[PDB]
Amino acid sequence: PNLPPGFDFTDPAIYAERLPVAEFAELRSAAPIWWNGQDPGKGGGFHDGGFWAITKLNDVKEISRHSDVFSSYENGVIPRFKNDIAREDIEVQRFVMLNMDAPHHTRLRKIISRGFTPRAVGRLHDELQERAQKIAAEAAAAGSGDFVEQVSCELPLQAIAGLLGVPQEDRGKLFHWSNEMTGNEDPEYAHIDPKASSAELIGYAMKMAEEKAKNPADDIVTQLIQADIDGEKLSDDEFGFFVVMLAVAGNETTRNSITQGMMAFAEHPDQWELYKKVRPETAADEIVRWATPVTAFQRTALRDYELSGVQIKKGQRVVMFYRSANFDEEVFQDPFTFNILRNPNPHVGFGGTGAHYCIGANLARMTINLIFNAVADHMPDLKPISAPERLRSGWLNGIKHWQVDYTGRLPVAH
As measured in angstroms, the least distance from the Cβ of 284 to ligand HEM is 8
Q: Which is nearer to ligand HEM, 157 or 206 (CB)?
A: 157
Backbone region of residue 41 per phi and psi (left: phi > 0; alpha: psi in -120 to 50; beta: other values): left
Minimum CB separation of residue 112 from ligand HEM in Å reads 7
CB of 357 to ligand HEM, least distance (A): 5
Kindly tell me which of 292 and 339 has the beta carbon lying closer to ligand HEM. 292
Q: Say how far apart CA 122 and CA 111 lie, in whole Å.
A: 19
Bind-site residues for heme: 358
Least distance in angstroms from the C-beta of 229 to ligand HEM: 22
Q: Decide whether 140 or 177 has the Cβ nearer to ligand HEM.
A: 177
For the bound state, the minimum distance from the C-beta of residue 214 to ligand HEM, rounded and expressed in Å, comes to 25
> Which residues of the chain form contacts with ligand HEM (CB under 6 A)?
64, 97-98, 109, 160, 245-246, 249-250, 253-254, 257, 288, 293-294, 297, 349-352, 354, 356-360, 363-364
CA distance 394 to 80: 6
294 or 379: CB nearest ligand HEM = 294
Q: CB of residue 361 vs ligand HEM: minimum separation in angstroms? A: 7
Q: Using the minimum distance from each CB to ligand HEM, give the nearer residue, 140 or 157.
A: 157
Q: Taking the complex as a whole, how short is the minimal distance between the CB of residue 365 and ligand HEM, in angstroms?
A: 8
Half-sphere exposure of 142 (CA within 13 A, CB side): 18
- Which residues are annotated as part of the binding site for substrate? 183
Residues in a beta bridge with 399:
390
Nearer to ligand HEM, 3 or 293 (CB): 293
Pick between residue 109 and residue 383 the one whose CB is nearest to ligand HEM: 109
